[PDB]
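Subject: complex prediction, re-run

Hi both,

The earlier run crashed halfway through, so I resubmitted it with identical inputs.
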Amino acid sequence: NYLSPAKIDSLFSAQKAYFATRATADVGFRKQSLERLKEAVINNKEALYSALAEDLGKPKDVVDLAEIGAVLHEIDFALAHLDEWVAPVSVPSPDIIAPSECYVVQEPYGVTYIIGPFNYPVNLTLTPLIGAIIGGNTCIIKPSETTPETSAVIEKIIAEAFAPEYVAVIQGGRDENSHLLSLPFDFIFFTGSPNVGKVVMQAAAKHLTPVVLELGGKCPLIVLPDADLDQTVNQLMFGKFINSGQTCIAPDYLYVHYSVKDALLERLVERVKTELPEINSTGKLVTERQVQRLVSLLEATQGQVLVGSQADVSKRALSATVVDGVEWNDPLMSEELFGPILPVLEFDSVRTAIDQVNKHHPKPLAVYVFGKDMDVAKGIINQIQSGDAQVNGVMLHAFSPYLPFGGIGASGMGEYHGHFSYLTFTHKKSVRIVP
Amino acid sequence: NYLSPAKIDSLFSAQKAYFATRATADVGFRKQSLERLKEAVINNKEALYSALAEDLGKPKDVVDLAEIGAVLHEIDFALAHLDEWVAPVSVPSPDIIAPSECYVVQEPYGVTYIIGPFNYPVNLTLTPLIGAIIGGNTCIIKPSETTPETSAVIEKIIAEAFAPEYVAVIQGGRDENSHLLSLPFDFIFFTGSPNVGKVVMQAAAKHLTPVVLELGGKCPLIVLPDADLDQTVNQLMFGKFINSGQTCIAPDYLYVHYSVKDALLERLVERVKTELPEINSTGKLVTERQVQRLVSLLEATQGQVLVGSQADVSKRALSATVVDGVEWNDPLMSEELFGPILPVLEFDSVRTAIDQVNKHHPKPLAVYVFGKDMDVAKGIINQIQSGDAQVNGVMLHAFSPYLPFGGIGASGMGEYHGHFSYLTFTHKKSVRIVP
Ligand SMILES: NC(=O)c1ccc[n+]([C@@H]2O[C@H](COP(=O)([O-])OP(=O)(O)OC[C@H]3O[C@@H](n4cnc5c(N)ncnc54)[C@H](OP(=O)(O)O)[C@@H]3O)[C@@H](O)[C@H]2O)c1
Ligand SMILES: NC(=O)c1ccc[n+]([C@@H]2O[C@H](COP(=O)([O-])OP(=O)(O)OC[C@H]3O[C@@H](n4cnc5c(N)ncnc54)[C@H](OP(=O)(O)O)[C@@H]3O)[C@@H](O)[C@H]2O)c1
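This time it finished cleanly. Structure:
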């Protein structure tokens, strides 16, 4: 079924050899590589629709926004900017080292490893791949085995665009991953849970391999007394229930000022009941196990269910759920939920709200603050370390090529997208020229 | 002697609490912190001169250039620019997320850890510290154990400038280091050997701690036919034998075209036997145990000694030595020498020279090329991965704040100096504001 370790070693060796050919050095090569990836993605749209529907119940419109469209936009943006990015940057020379001409080169790493997660398998495998490509690297991709249909199409896309010595997909489970992690890769890009990130970095240490880790945690959505409540409910609906809550930058929990909680939940519960009435309205959880995990949490919570909490394990379905009266103590606040459940906590003092986030779940991937006072909103953001942040918005910062997407501490290290992907998949090389 | 684990934990805990105060937020505080650092260094030069002469036999002018002057120049560069650096950067917003306003914030990591090497203990502890400071972090510094005198002065300099809740020195050995590496630091800066880099990274993995590793390797100095032999010998004399060859960016070995090898070696050997005649002309090796290691290598060499070889383990000294007729097989081409020995190898064409360096000792911290054909010299540099590179010069690239300094692969991960220190000691936080 999966490649044997021998064939994996052999595939790895052919990429090492291919890189040493310096085939990837010129920008003309890198640009046509992007054109071939783009073309291969477009050729396989319909297969991606079916694969993502089967694996995760993703609607076609979502796939076009968050999966296919996200990648194609990054590709087009990279193509229009690559000539600028690969150009040597000349710097001044101080007098102590004069006379000399100095400049900075962004130099490729070599053979790279991309580990793909289940939840947005196209976005989070192929967008970093763009990084590897424009940086002048080769790449081995291991998509998630828990989304088998889309992993197969990803392999088909890559096989169709590229020779395996340049870019290859290796499907596999635990055993194939630990084997690949033991190889002397030159760069490793991982997207997944904090505990597996620890495993990836530990393996990376043994070969001194630099890593980027895009991890998780619990993103708060904080609602100030002066927030536009319809706007807030809209973003909650979008952010919390897209892909059954299986999003790294999804609002994990709601942190609302006591004085607008009743009015907020009234709007929210009504819209959930109206727009998400079916048990599989949000999509599918990736595995039956995940549904059972979430059901146990619901069975253990001290909060009050306002809507939902209906589950069909065999369907991999859990209805959109809102749970009121939750404390930091609650089972729903122990771990990242990654499910269509929204626990609701209350605050009065903004200073205390800040402290509570920092104390219980610090450094999330994103902090969301909803309100009309920008000083108060920005002030909250500036006092909560997080990967990224938004005021009166959700998720869409990850779809901008101008913004460095990445976490801090337990939510990760390193950033990418746009120019930042290029800088992430190269190292800075100083050059000093003496006459 | 050394602080107990209980007080180390107690010291670490206080920096966490102090960072949480947001004391380090405003740029004014950071600028004053550098001023206090600068004055503390200046007010202690004499003690540094003595300590460094005692530990390593460093001449006053070497200390003025590569130690005291190096961090003073960085401090002044940082002070002159920091106001511009800390200002949030507004970025474009694509139409897909309109309407919104977006910007990037460079946000401090928190409590950082700086491990100092023996060979340049002032430069490679205080220059990273500058980054820690201007990043808005706190810092715990552990200087090398093997240079008692200077480490003691560093502690004095740091205590003079800073309260221990902000920046603190903790002297110690392997046991103190492994205990510090077990604490939940928010960032670790390491300078040292590759094998210890693995230890540091493996420990950082357990807390998802981002690292920068400034490591080792064997920097080649490659000599083309039309090179200036006078220039070449001057730079070798300067680069190879400064601090007894205990320099990370020193030319470890000489790699010279066959047609000029004899002429170059006549010029080089004559200069060595006259300018470096005594057993301790180059200075002191760090330990007696090091001397013994170097001598043993000379015993096993298949190459012909041309000068020096004489050594005195008792006074931590070894004579400037040039070894001719060396192949990659040789016991002198196995490890990083880090001593007063210059092995000399030879090649028949540029093509073979490039391929042999990449084959036997790839990714060194620096590649040096001497010749007057720039297209050829650059051509070599472009085909050998390395942290940094020079044509017709050595070492001085590390003394320009406009140049990022750092390795690749075995020579390390990450860069610093100048603006790059600010960027390394912070993370990029995207912020999107929706009306
Ligand atoms: N910052 C971001 O960009 C981002 C994006 C999406 C998700 N996330 C985070 O990812 C997590 C959820 O996604 P996930 O369930 O796919 O994370 P995951 O469990 O860490 O899996 C990620 C990848 O690593 C493999 N894997 C899982 N457990 C492993 C283990 N003990 N040892 C070795 N490999 C292992 C997986 O293989 P298989 O799946 O094939 O078994 C998968 O390919 C959440 O924490 C989320 O916040 C972050
Ligand atoms: N890229 C750069 O910035 C740069 C510049 C110059 C030199 N270097 C590198 O520095 C290296 C040599 O210096 P060094 O001997 O001081 O490096 P080192 O042996 O790796 O030690 C560096 C630090 O780690 C501690 N340490 C050493 N060995 C250890 C072990 N086995 N376990 C745990 N901790 C350990 C040391 O404490 P104690 O020393 O107090 O015992 C010291 O503070 C060379 O490889 C050179 O290439 C790098």
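The pocket of NAP (ligand 1) is lined by residues A 115-119, 124, 144-146, 173-174, 177, 191-193, 196, 199, 214-216, 248, 336, 338, 365, 407, 412 (CB under 6 Å).

- K.
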